[PDB]
A paper describes a structure:
Gram‐negative pathogens like Burkholderia pseudomallei use trimeric autotransporter adhesins such as BpaC as key molecules in their pathogenicity. The TAA BpaC was first extensively described in 2013 (Campos et al., 2013); of the nine predicted B. pseudomallei TAAs, BpaC is the only one associated with all of the three features involved in pathogenicity: macrophage survival, virulence, and serum survival (Lazar Adler et al., 2015).
Our 1.4 Å crystal structure of the membrane‐proximal part of the BpaC head domain shows that the domain is exclusively made of left‐handed parallel β‐roll repeats. Having settled on BpaC741–1054 as the region to express, we used the engineered trimeric GCN4 leucine zipper (Hernandez Alvarez et al., 2008) to preserve the DAVNxxQL neck motif at the C‐terminal end by replacing the coiled‐coil that would be in the membrane β‐barrel in the wt structure. There was a single molecule in the asymmetric unit, and the TAA trimer formed around the crystallographic threefold axis. The final model contains all of the residues in BpaC from position 14 in layer 22 to the end of layer 42 (residues 741–1021), followed by a long neck from E1022 to Q1054, the GCN4 anchor, with 282 water molecules, of which 42 are ordered in specific channels or the trimer core cavity. All three chains of the C‐terminal head domain of BpaC thread around a central hydrophilic core in a helical fashion with an average turn of 5.7° ± 0.6° for layers 23–41 and a rise of 4.8 Å ± 0.1 Å (the last one, from 1008–1021, has a turn of just 2.5°), calculated per turn, typical of other LPBRs. In BpaC, only negatively charged residues face the solvent—in stark contrast to the primarily positive surface charge of the left‐handed parallel β‐roll “type” protein, YadA. The pIs of the solved LPBR structures demonstrate this clearly: the pI of the LPBR is clearly correlated with its position within the passenger domain, with BpaC having a pI of about 2.3 and YadA of 9.2. The structure reported here of BpaC741–1054 contains the highest number of LPBR repeats in an experimental structure and is the longest, at 89.5 Å.
Residue numbers in the entry:
A (entry chain A), B (entry chain A), C (entry chain A): 2 to 330
């Protein structure tokens, strides 16, 4: 009964201006409304409903598909049983739900229920505030969480996960790479199959592991398993408490040990192995090699204080003195 | 008036072949066109328009919703006031706009205006050429920019940002982690709340900070604030110009200083602190410990040149000589 | 002929309950079905078809647009020539295809053909199992591959690429940054224009390059080109086999060489340059400076074994002895 309006089908209603109802009990009551299908409803302003029992009751709403429902202001729902119920909500796919304000859900059973949430992919879930999930079966449930990849999961507050099966579960955790795990508080990992599980741990490289609290493991298969350990280099190990290893295959296993160079090994407490292949097994020493593989130390200035090193020139002056004491005797 | 065509409603037109117009002034003039709603228009080839004042005028266009407009070739627009105007453009959501060629925009007020641009999320913006934004309120405005996460922003040319509130604003900058900032030219940061603000700076770890030009900070809360500084380890600091710190809690504060080991500290100019807990405060020295905590240096080969170090065996030969000069006297 | 059903147009059929067919040969045969357009077909349960030759034959299917086809269970297709044929499949855009089970494809010519695949963007491709592509022209073709950014490509099994033109082509490879390349097996790179091309290589920083097998390059423009090389610092180079460089502009070019400090250079085989500006050119030595720029070594404990270093206090005891041998002579 509205202006420039048609109502075809039994008990259909076109009361809105510029409205077009069609189908048994199709109700196009909003202004500029179009309702198609049995029991379809376009009651909002500028609303369009297509499909049996479809509902476009929000202002500026569009619902397409059987039982599709666009009840939010500025809502759009496509697919059987889709629901766009938040303000500024958009749903595309069967049984998709965009129920948060400013939410967008795309894929069968995709769910964007947080404020400002976005879920893309079948059975993706963006349930945290300001959460973003992109990938089938992905989950961004933490506040500010972002998950990208199939089965990626960002569950910590401020967590970010990128990669198939990646998991960022600690507060302020970040994981990148397939199967990467950032589970410590304030943990960061990047590399497929890498793990940063200590609090304050950071790992970089495929299969790198920073399990110590405050540990840092950088390089493929690097291991920083001690508290406060640092390991840089593929296959490096810093397993002592407060240990430091630098170089491929370096090994700092003593408490406080330091190993610098490819294949350097330091097992002594507070010891240092300096140089490729150097070995420091004695506690509280600096080794510049190993037995049979000693190194000269060069560009040493003359020592002055009692615990400074001595250079050859200082010794040669004593030798010359003894020579002359050989003439005087 | 087209073949296999129906036109129900006043002043409706079905001139295209296989065309179906329905509604006051519904115009289904394209081939294989279907126009539903008052003033709806399906004028393109293989075009489908549903909703009051909806327009599908592109070839292979589909417009659904009041005022929805699919004017590009191969364009698809769903939602009230949606607009797919580029070639190969797709828009889903109220007031979404896909105006670039090869552009895709999903979410209320989402905007994909660059060539090859993709925006997913309420009020997301992909305005750069080859730009990608995924997250409510995200922005990829640089050329080749990619932004993922709610309120993520990639504004530099070639910038990439991943995480809630992440920001990549320098040229060729990359930020990963919630609240991460890559603001220097050619800067790279990964870790929640991390910052790479120097030109050529790189930071890895939660709250790591590389503010120096050409600086590198690796580990949770690491600080590389000097020009050309390098800090690796949780809580490491390299604040001197051209300083280097390796180990948890290491501190290289002198110009040109080097601190290697957990808790090593080097404040002297061009000094080196080698070993856990070592201290180098004297300018232009290498310290292997600290006063009271001296270390032996081991596996030292006999010195040859004047500035080589001397080992015990060389001294013992002088001692034996003096012993015999004790017999001869 | 179904209950609460209307069939307007020649040879249209509304046999389903609550079904509404409209248009020449429009077939609304499913329960709660709505078919609009010439030759449109809504045969599934809870199915809705809009557009000439549109087909909604899946249960809970919705097809919109000319030739649009929703044949999968729980399938939704929007756009001319769109096809949602997998179980739980969703397609939005002209010629989009969601043919995998649990697949979601958005954008003109977007293709989600893998199981659990998700493609967003014009001409995006998610063809691997558990693959995710987000960006125009992006490709996630590996098993578990994830690609984000325009023209991003994740082609390895378990590969993850983020950034415009980023490429992760090795097994378990991860690339982040515009133009980043992770091409080695188990390679990881993060930084625009960075490359990890060795097997087991890892690179961090803009334009960092880890081309050696088992190499690690950390810092802007760092180069770890030797087998097993490690370079940390902007502009650092570790080009020797099994070489290690730490510090901005450090250079470890000898086999087994180690350079620690900004501008330290070690060209000797198995040599070590320790300290800013130190130079180690002699094979199998540890240099603490360079000629003209020698450093004292401090906090050295008295040597005990033959290859331990000697400190000044040990030499002063010999000097005092010689003094007294000067009185006795
Ligand atoms: Na070990
Ligand atoms: Na400090
Ligand atoms: Na070089």
């Amino acid at each position: 009964s509205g202006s420039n309006s048609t109502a075809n089908g039994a008990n259909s209603t076109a009361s809105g201006d510029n409205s077009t109802a069609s189908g048994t009990n199709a109700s196009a009551t909003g202004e500029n409304s179009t309702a198609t299908g049995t029991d379809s409803t376009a009651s909002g302003s500028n609303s369009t409903a297509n499909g049996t029992n479809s509902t476009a009751s929000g202002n500026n709403s569009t619902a397409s598909g059987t039982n599709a429902s666009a009840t939010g202001e500025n809502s759009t729902a496509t697919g059987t049983d889709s629901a766009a119920s938040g303000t500024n909500s958009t749903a595309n796919g069967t049984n998709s739900t965009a129920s948060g304000d400013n939410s967008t859900a795309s894929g069968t059973n995709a769910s964007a229920t947080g404020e400002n949430s976005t879920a893309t992919g079948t059975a993706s879930t963006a349930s945290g505030s300001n959460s973003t999930a992109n990938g089938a079966n992905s989950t961004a449930s933490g506040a500010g969480a972002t998950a990208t990849g199939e089965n990626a999961a960002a569950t910590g507050a401020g967590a970010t996960a990128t990669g198939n099966n990646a998991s960022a579960s600690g507060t302020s955790s970040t994981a990148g790479g397939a199967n990467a795990i950032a589970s410590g508080e304030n943990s960061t990992t990047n590399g497929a199959n890498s793990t940063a599980s200590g609090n304050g741990s950071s790992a970089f490289g495929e299969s790198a592991a920073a399990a110590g609290d405050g540990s840092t493991a950088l390089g493929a298969n690097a291991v920083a398993s001690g508290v406060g350990s640092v390991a840089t280099g593929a296959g490096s190990v810093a397993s002592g408490a407060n240990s430091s290893a630098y170089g491929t295959g370096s090994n700092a296993t003593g408490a406080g040990s330091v190993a610098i160079g490819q294949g350097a090994t330091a097992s002594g407490s507070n010891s240092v192995a300096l140089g490729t292949g150097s070995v420091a097994s004695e506690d509280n020493t600096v080794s510049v090699g190993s037995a049979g593989s000693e190194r000269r130390i060069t560009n040493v200035a003359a020592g002055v204080n009692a615990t400074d090193a001595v250079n050859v020139g200082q010794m040669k002056q004593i030798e010359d003195k003894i020579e002359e004491i050989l003439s005087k005797i």
